[PDB]
Design a binder for these strands. Structure first.
Lengths: 91, 77, 77, 277, 94, 63
DNA sequence: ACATGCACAGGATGTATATATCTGACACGTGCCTGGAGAC
DNA sequence: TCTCCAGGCACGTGTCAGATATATACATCCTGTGCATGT
């Protein structure tokens, strides 16, 4: 029974080290993660099918993020994603 | 006749949370009607998923799916 | 330290005589803060001791009391 | 002159057998009692003895409640196990979950238990007795021992309040210090034992306390006749026995006051304290 | 307190708490009363009824906000059936 | 078949009482054993350190 | 003669020292197995 | 695609921060209420 709990916890103890989070709040945050995942993945799939592609590349994920997230949110998200993919490629 | 179990005090509290200062006495029966229509829409979908799954028990996920289907995503389950 | 308290100054004399006699002492206090101060003093005059107070956890209690009773090197508790 | 309850897989010392008797009579005649043998004479065994006697003769096998300090529970559980092997003890300490399960052992329908019951003696702390008083109050108890009864020396203690409200036929307090501090704290125990006969602290004060408390505190004259009358009032309810009669073998203590003058710093502090008035 | 002030105190009380505002057993009985029109002898997870309640209370609270603005627009401080119907009207729930 | 299933339901229901009683009695006893049966230690670390020091002494060394 | 203001009665509240209990959330250890990772 | 093992998940456990009453003493704050004085 898989959940993004673990990771929510690692991020929390990175951003507010002495603060915990409740079980209910963990549930809500996990739901948040699943929802955003779904939305981005789905928009990406649509973009792919619309351009007659059959693959969801980094560039699909980027454009999905730019369609979905607003303003500064979108910009910062694009930035983080690009940084991550760059580091991955380097390694 | 279980609808009137949604009490005048219960409706009053919800109107208070919604920032309402004074409540005309006809609101209580409208609110019951509105709530019943909303519940019917969600429960019909929840039961539809339940039947499809060949279950006899409505689960929390069936309700969460029904709410998402209706643009009222419910976080926490 | 040992002279800024009249009691402590008189306890010093008495503990020297008790030690030279081969007596073993339970030494009782009404304040655990004082238990701390003393803990020092005993280190200075280099006497062996145990401690049991309301901070001392239950199985640790059992352990300490058993020591004092098993191993005659300990002079004060 | 009863016999060691035969259900008792040990032999009592003389005084525990005289003490057994006392508690057997204090039952037959409806009275309660404080057993106030000086600290270390074996109070536990006499209590367990009464309960076993009850069983053997009156076939009343339960339920018995022992309340005790938390620290003492294992000792009690082992002593019960040793001296009455046939007695099924139910430990009643543990997390909420542990206790919830154990509550399922409480037979509330049988007024009086017989041998094959779920449990005979329940053993529990003062703290639990008070937190779980909701539950304890439903039960109806056939006898009750409070050990280290000085725990309920205050009539204003939640602890005395709770335990006084338990439906029990018979209470036995164990404490080698009926009084320590005021005499008030002896009224507390007497009222707990027999709330009928010691129904009013104020009366108690007026008639006995203020004399005896002034004879100590301001060296007034002790009214011999009043004091004798108090002893009288206490006599059928309290048994006290002292080591010099029954554990003779120990040699005595030597006590020494060792006097100390304040050092300089001490004094200059003491006096600022005094000047702050 | 001068009249109308206790109402603003009650509003504050209800806006700072997170508790559910409908009683649990009345709501549960309404859910089952509706459900048996769609299929008889339905069972419900305990958590499913709570999910419905949270969604239902959130819906009604949001509706009352929109209702309030309809009243205030008409220069009233009292909400009325008309205000609910306009809110439902413009939301497209009609 | 329906009568057979009714008989089978009596059988399962009869068995449920035995199955419940067995687990209830076992878990009741396990908890008495959990509390009364008990008493041990934790300075396990102290014991380990003592053993390590003894092992070090068991080695003659002139460095 | 009536009303208001000011001090007794004795109680509840309060200050300070560790004791005696406790509870639930966090951290840590254990076991294990499947799916993240290898690389052709 | 065949292969591997370790990261993570389920499960116990244990402990300790803040909380529940309190013996040991006493001064202090509180305010119901009674009495006296003034209008």
């Amino acid at each position: 029974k898989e959940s993004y709990s673990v990771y929510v916890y690692k991020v929390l103890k990175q951003v507010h080290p002495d603060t915990g989070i409740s079980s209910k709040a963990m549930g809500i945050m996990n739901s948040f993660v699943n929802d955003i995942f779904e939305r981005i993945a789905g928009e990406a799939s649509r973009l792919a099918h619309y351009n007659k592609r059959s693959t969801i590349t980094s560039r699909e994920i980027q454009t999905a993020v730019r369609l979905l997230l607003p303003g500064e949110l979108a910009k910062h998200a694009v930035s983080e994603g690009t940084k991550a993919v760059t580091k991955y490629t380097s390694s | 006749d279980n609808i009137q179990g949604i009490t005048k005090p219960a409706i009053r509290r919800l109107a208070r949370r919604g920032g309402v200062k004074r409540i005309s006495g006809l609101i209580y029966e409208e609110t019951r009607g509105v709530l019943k229509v909303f519940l019917e829409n969600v429960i019909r979908d929840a039961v539809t998923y339940t039947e499809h799954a060949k279950r006899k028990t409505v689960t929390a996920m069936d309700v969460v799916y029904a709410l998402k289907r209706q643009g009222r995503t419910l976080y926490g389950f | 330290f040992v002279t800024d308290s009249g009691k402590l100054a008189k306890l010093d004399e008495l503990l020297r005589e008790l030690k030279e006699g081969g007596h073993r002492v339970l030494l009782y206090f009404q304040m655990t803060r004082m238990i701390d101060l003393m803990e020092e003093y005993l280190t200075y005059r280099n006497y062996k001791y145990c401690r049991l107070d309301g901070s001392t956890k239950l199985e640790d209690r059992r352990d300490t009391v058993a020591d004092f009773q098993t191993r005659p090197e300990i002079f004060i508790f | 002159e009863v016999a060691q309850p035969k259900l008792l897989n040990c032999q009592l010392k003389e005084y525990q057998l005289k003490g057994l008797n006392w508690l057997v009579n204090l039952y037959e005649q409806g009275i309660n009692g404080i057993l106030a043998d000086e600290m270390g004479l074996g109070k536990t065994v006499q209590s367990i003895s009464v309960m076993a006697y009850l069983a053997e003769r009156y076939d009343i096998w339960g339920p018995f409640l022992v309340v005790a300090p938390a620290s003492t529970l294992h000792n009690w559980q082992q002593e019960v196990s040793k001296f009455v092997p046939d007695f099924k003890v139910l430990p009643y300490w543990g997390t909420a979950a542990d206790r919830k399960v154990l509550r399922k052992f409480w037979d509330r329908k049988h007024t009086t238990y017989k041998k094959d019951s779920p449990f005979h003696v329940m053993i529990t702390s003062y703290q639990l007795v008070v937190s779980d008083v909701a539950y304890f109050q439903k039960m109806k108890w056939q006898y009750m021992i409070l050990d280290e009864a000085q725990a309920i020396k205050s009539s204003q203690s939640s602890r005395w309040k709770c335990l006084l409200g338990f439906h029990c036929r018979n209470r036995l307090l164990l404490t080698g210090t009926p009084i320590q501090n005021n005499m008030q704290e002896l009224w507390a125990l007497l009222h707990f034992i027999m709330p009928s006969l010691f129904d009013s602290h104020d009366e108690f004060s007026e008639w006995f306390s203020k004399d005896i408390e002034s004879h100590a505190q301001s060296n007034t004259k002790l009214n011999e006749d009043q004091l004798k009358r108090l002893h009288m009032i206490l006599k059928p309810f309290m048994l006290r026995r002292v080591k010099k009669h029954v554990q003779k073998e120990l040699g005595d203590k030597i006590e020494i006051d060792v006097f100390c003058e304040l050092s300089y710093r001490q004094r200059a502090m003491y006096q600022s304290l005094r000047n702050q008035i | 307190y001068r009249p109308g002030t206790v109402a603003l105190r009650e509003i504050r009380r209800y806006q700072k708490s997170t508790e559910l505002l409908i009683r649990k057993l009345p709501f549960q009985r309404l859910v089952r009363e509706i459900a048996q029109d769609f299929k008889t002898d339905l069972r419900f997870q305990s958590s499913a009824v709570m999910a419905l309640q949270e969604a239902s209370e959130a819906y009604l609270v949001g509706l009352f906000e929109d209702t309030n603005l309809c009243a205030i627009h008409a220069k009233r401080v009292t909400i009325m059936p008309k205000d609910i119907q306009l809110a439902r009207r413009i939301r497209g729930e009609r | 078949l329906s009568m057979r299933r009714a008989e089978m339901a009596r059988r399962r229901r009869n068995l449920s009482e035995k199955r419940n009683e067995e687990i209830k009695m076992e878990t009741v006893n396990k908890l008495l054993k959990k509390q009364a049966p008990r008493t041990t230690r934790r300075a396990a670390q102290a014991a380990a350190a003592a053993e390590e020091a003894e092992e070090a002494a068991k080695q003659p060394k002139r460095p």
